[PDB]
Amino acid sequence: PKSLLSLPLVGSLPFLPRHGHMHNNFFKLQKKYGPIYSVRMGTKTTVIVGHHQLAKEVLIKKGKDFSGRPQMATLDIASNNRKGIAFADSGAHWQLHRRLAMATFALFKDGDQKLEKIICQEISTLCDMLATHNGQSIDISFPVFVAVTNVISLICFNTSYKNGDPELNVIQNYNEGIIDNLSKDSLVDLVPWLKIFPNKTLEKLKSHVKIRNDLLNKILENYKEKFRSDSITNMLDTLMQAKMNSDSELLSDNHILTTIGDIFGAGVETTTSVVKWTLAFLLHNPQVKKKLYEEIDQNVGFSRTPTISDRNRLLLLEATIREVLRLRPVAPMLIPHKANVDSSIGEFAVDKGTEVIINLWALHHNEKEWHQPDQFMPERFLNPAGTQLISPSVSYLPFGAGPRSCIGEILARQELFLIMAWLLQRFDLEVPDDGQLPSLEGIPKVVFLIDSFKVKIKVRQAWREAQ
Amino acid sequence: SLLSLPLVGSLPFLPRHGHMHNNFFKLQKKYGPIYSVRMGTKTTVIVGHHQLAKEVLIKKGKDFSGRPQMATLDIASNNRKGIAFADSGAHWQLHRRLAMATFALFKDGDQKLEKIICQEISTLCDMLATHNGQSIDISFPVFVAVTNVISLICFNTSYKNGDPELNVIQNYNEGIIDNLSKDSLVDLVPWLKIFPNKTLEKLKSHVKIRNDLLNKILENYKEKFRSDSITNMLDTLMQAKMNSDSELLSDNHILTTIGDIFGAGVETTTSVVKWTLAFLLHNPQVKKKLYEEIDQNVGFSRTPTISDRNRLLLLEATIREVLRLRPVAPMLIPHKANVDSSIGEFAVDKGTEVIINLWALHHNEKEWHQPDQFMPERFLNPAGTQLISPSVSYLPFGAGPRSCIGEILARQELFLIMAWLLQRFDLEVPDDGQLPSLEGIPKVVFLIDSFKVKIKVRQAWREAQ
Ligand code: HEM
Ligand code: HEM
Ligand SMILES: [C-]#[N+][C@H](C)[C@@H]1CC[C@@H]2[C@@H]3CC[C@H]4C[C@@H](OC=O)CC[C@]4(C)[C@H]3CC[C@@]21C
Ligand SMILES: [C-]#[N+][C@H](C)[C@@H]1CC[C@@H]2[C@@H]3CC[C@H]4C[C@@H](OC=O)CC[C@]4(C)[C@H]3CC[C@@]21C
C-alpha cells in the first residue's frame, strides 16, 4: 500500500526555544528520556544530568574530570578572556586564584576582623536606614546591595563605602547591565542566536565591563602604594603577596583584577537575590512569618542583637533559608561544567570537551526525594517536634560540590542568617498598601532573580517598648 | 408607539478615557469655548479661550479667586491651610503675601538665588559625571538638587549626600501625587464616594509622615529663631506671628504653608526638567543647536550664569516651548466663584467651580502655528536674535490673584540646570534605543513616564579642564 513520504528533517529540538524556564523544560523531559541525555548544537554536544546519583559522579567522584568550563562569547567578555575563578577553565590560573581566594577567608576567621563583626556592623547600618522609612512601602534591593557590597569590599581591600558615595550607584548600574546582557537562561543557551542575527549584546557587554575594569583598576593602583608585605589582611594583600613571592604569569594585574571582580559580583548579587527571595516567600506565608517572630522573641528577645551563635536557637529561621535555597536556587543549573578528558557518567561515554550541565532544579524538585517539592515548607528541614534541624534528602546541593563548588558558602550562610534575624527582630514586614504580592515565578538569568517588589516597613512595637 | 427612553444622566464623553483636558478641548468644536456640567448639585464651568480665561483670572480675578473644597485636597492641605488649596480669605491672603516677601531676602547678597541654585547644580553635575558612559534615570538627582535649593529658602539648611530623609520625602511625595487625583484635579465623576476604596486612607497615612517630619523641623527651629536674623521663609512666618494676625499664623498653618512651598518647588521643577530632556531626545536637531549656542556664548572658561539668558536665546525659547506643550498644570488649579458674577456675559453663580483649560489655550490652532509640534523657534524672531511672544494665549504660570508665586525661582532653576548640563554632558538615547513617551500622565502634575538617558562627559569640557 503506497504512502506519502515523510519530510526530510534537518533539525530537531524537544521543546520550543524561549518558551518556559530552561531548567524546568529539561526536567520535564526526564519523564520521556531519563535523567541524562544529550543535545547537539552544530559540533558542540551538551549533556544534561538530572539525578543526584549522576550529579555526584560528575561533581565529586569524577570532579577533576568534569571541572572544566566551556568557552562562551559572553563569559569571555565578563571574565576578561577566562580569568578570575567562576568562568576560568580548569588550569593553573584557576587552581591558584581559587586557592588564594579561599585562603583569604582565614584572614577573617576570628579576632577583630571576625566575619560576624564585619557583617553585624553593616547590618546595623542597614537597619538604621530602613527604620527611617517607618510606615512606608519600599524596595529594599539597594539598601541590601550596599550592605553586602561593604562587607565584600572590607574582605577585599579593608575599605568600605560612605552613605551616598555615588560609586555604589555606578556599580549597581554595570552589575545590572552585565546580568541583563550575559544570558537569558541560567547560562544554558541552547541556540546561539547571538551569532545568527545582527545584535549588540556583545557590544553592550563590553561597555559595562569597561566601566567595571576601569573602576577596579583605579583601586588596584591606589593600593600599590598602600601595600605592605608585613600586613596581609584582605584578599588584595593575599594576591599581591603571592605575586611578590613568585607564579607571576598567573598573578598578572588583569588576573588579579578579574579575580577580585568575581568575588565582588558573586558576593553581592547572590546574597542580595536570596534575601529578596526570602522576604517574598514570607509575604506569601504569614503563618511562617508569625512563627519566626515568636521564635526570635523567645530565644533572643530585645536586650541584644542576634549573633551567629543564635543559629543554634533560631532553627525555623535556618530551615527557611534552607527551604528558599531549595526552591529558588541562585543557580538552578549551577555553572556549566566541561569534560577535561574522555570519561563517563553512569557508564555512558562522555568525550573530552563535552559541556555537562547539572540540573539543580530537577534535583531539588524530585518528587521521590521531596514531599510536595513545589511548596514552601520550612518544616521539611526540622524534625517533627521542630527541635532539631535535619537533612530530609541527599538531593540537595544549593552550593554545588567538588572542585568547582562555592568558595563563599560560609560568608553567604552568615550574611543570610544575620540579615534575616536582625530584620525580623526590629521590623514588621507587610504587603504594601496597594496589596500587590511579588511574583514567585522568577527570572532565570546568570542569577535566578525575583522581580522587584515593594514591602511595607514598620518598626515593631515589641522592639520600640524595649527602648 | 415607540418612545425615547427616560434619561436620568448624560455626559458628553466617557469617563477615564483619554486626557480630560483634551476631551474638554475637543468639545469646544461643538459647544463653544465655555460650557458647564452639573454633577449632582455641583456645577462646574470649563473655559477654553484666552479672552475668557483672562476675564476669570485678571479682570475679575478677585471674583474667581476661590478654591473648591475636595476631600482629597482637604487631607493634603490639613483642611485647606497653606496657599494652593486654601480658599480665598484672610489665611490664604496673609501666607501668600509672606511667602512672596520671602523671595526679596534672596534678591541679592551672598544668598542671591543664583548663588544658591548654582551651588546645588554643581553638586548634581559632579554626581552625574560619575555615571560617565551609563544610562540612568536622572529623576532623583534633580529632585535632591531642587529639594536643597528650597530647603535653603525655607530653613537655611540643605541635606548632605546620602541623607535617608530625601528618600523618605520622595516616597510620600510619590504617594500623595499618586493618590491625589487621576486627572488634573478635575475628577468629574466622584468615584471615591460611590464605591468602596482606600484612597483617603492612603493619603492620610502619607500626609501623616509629611506632617510629622515637618513638625520635627519646625519645633527644633523654635530654639534657633532670632528676631534679628530674618533670612528664610520660616523666619518670615515666625516674625509675623511674634509681631501679632496671630490666629492665622498657627503652627499647623505655618507647617502647611511650608509643606506647599516644598511640594510646589520640588515636583514642578523636577517634572519640567524631565520633560525638557525628553523633547531633546526626540529632537536631536534642536539639541545640537543648543550645544552650538552655549559653546559660542559661554564656552568652557566658566560655568553659565543667569546673565547668560541674554545670549542663550534658543535655550530660553526651548524652555518656553516645553511649558507651552506640556504645562505642569494643564487645567491650572480649579478656581471658584466667590460671588455672583459673569464670564463672557453669561451668569455664573457663587460657589460655581470654574476651570481654566490651559491646554486649550496653548493648542489653539488660530493662535499658534502647528501647535502639536515642538518648535522652540516659534519664540524667536525669524533671525534667531531676539525672543518674541508669538501669542497672548500663553499662561504657563497662571495670572491674577492665584498666580504662581515661584515663577522667578522656577525660571532660574530651569534655565541654569539645562545650561550647566548641556555645557558638560552629552545626553543621548540609552543603549537599547528606547525613547521616552511624550504622552504624559495627567496627575496633580502633568508628569512624564520614567525614562533613562545615556550621560557622557563632553570632550570639549574634558579637553578644556
Ligand atoms: C546563597 C548564596 C550562594 C549560593 C546558593 C551559591 C552557589 C554557587 C553555585 C551554585 C556555584 C556554581 C557551582 C558549580 O559550578 O558547581 C558557585 C560558585 C562560586 N561561588 Fe557561590 N553561591 C553563593 C554565594 C557566594 C558568595 C557570598 C561568594 C563570595 C564571597 C561566592 C563565590 C563564588 C565563586 C567565586 C564561585 C566560582 C567558583 C569556581 O568556579 O570555582 N558565592 N556558588
Ligand atoms: C515650571 C515650574 C512652575 C510652574 C509651571 C508653575 C505654575 C503654576 C500654576 C499654573 C499655578 C496655578 C495658577 C492658578 O491656579 O490660577 C501655580 C500656583 C502656585 N505655584 Fe507654581 N509653578 C511652578 C513652580 C513653582 C515653584 C518653584 C513654587 C514655589 C517655590 C510654586 C508655588 C506655587 C504656589 C504656592 C501656587 C499657589 C498660588 C495660590 O493658590 O495662591 N510654583 N503655579
Ligand atoms: C554563586 N554564584 C553564581 C553562579 C556566579 C558567582 C559570580 C558569578 C558572576 C561573576 C561576574 C559578575 C559580574 C557582575 O557585573 C559586573 O561586575 C554581575 C554579576 C556576575 C555576573 C556574577 C553572577 C553570579 C555568578 C555567575
Ligand atoms: C504649580 N504647581 C503645581 C501643579 C501645584 C503647586 C503645589 C501643589 C501641591 C502642594 C502639596 C504637595 C504635597 C506633596 O506630597 C508631600 O509633600 C506632593 C506634591 C504636592 C501635591 C504639590 C503638587 C503640585 C501643585 C498641585
Side-chain angles (χ1 to χ4, degrees), chain A residues 378-390:
Chain A
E379 55 260 31
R380 82 172 70 249
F381 282 100
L382 304 163
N383 53 2
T387 82
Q388 198 201 118
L389 284 162
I390 66 184

Side-chain angles (χ1 to χ4, degrees), chain B residues 398-448:
Chain B
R402 308 303 301 234
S403 72
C404 188
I405 68 189
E407 186 175 348
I408 174 56
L409 171 60
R411 284 193 181 282
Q412 307 206 346
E413 248 169 7
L414 290 178
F415 173 83
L416 281 164
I417 290 159
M418 303 305 319
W420 283 56
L421 293 168
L422 289 148
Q423 169 182 69
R424 186 168 174 191
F425 292 118
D426 275 339
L427 310 149
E428 253 281 275
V429 172
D431 313 57
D432 290 312
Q434 287 196 280
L435 285 141
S437 158
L438 306 166
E439 170 169 275
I441 307 137
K443 306 256 213 65
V444 84
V445 179
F446 198 11
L447 308 165
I448 197 180

Side-chain angles (χ1 to χ4, degrees), chain A residues 297-312:
Chain A
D297 295 334
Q298 306 239 33
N299 288 270
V300 188
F302 305 96
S303 86
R304 52 169 186 94
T305 56
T307 37
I308 276 278
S309 72
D310 292 305
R311 264 207 282 207
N312 306 307

Side-chain angles (χ1 to χ4, degrees), chain B residues 27 48 52 93 101 126 146 197 214 259 293 295 382 402 447 457:
Chain B
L27 285 178
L52 308 174
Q93 185 154 54
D126 293 354
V146 303
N197 69 98
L214 273 179
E293 175 170 86
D295 287 349
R402 308 303 301 234
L447 308 165
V457 175

Side-chain angles (χ1 to χ4, degrees), chain B residues 125 287-305 308 311-312 418-426 456-465:
Chain B
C125 281
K287 210 181 82 214
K288 183 200 298 222
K289 281 143 75 203
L290 284 174
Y291 285 119
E292 290 171 334
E293 175 170 86
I294 190 145
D295 287 349
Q296 175 115 332
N297 292 266
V298 177
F300 304 80
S301 98
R302 58 165 179 86
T303 61
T305 59
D308 287 322
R311 326 217 271 201
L312 306 191
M418 303 305 319
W420 283 56
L421 293 168
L422 289 148
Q423 169 182 69
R424 186 168 174 191
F425 292 118
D426 275 339
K456 269 199 304 143
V457 175
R458 300 186 54 203
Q459 287 287 135
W461 164 284
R462 233 201 265 299
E463 152 164 46
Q465 218 250 18

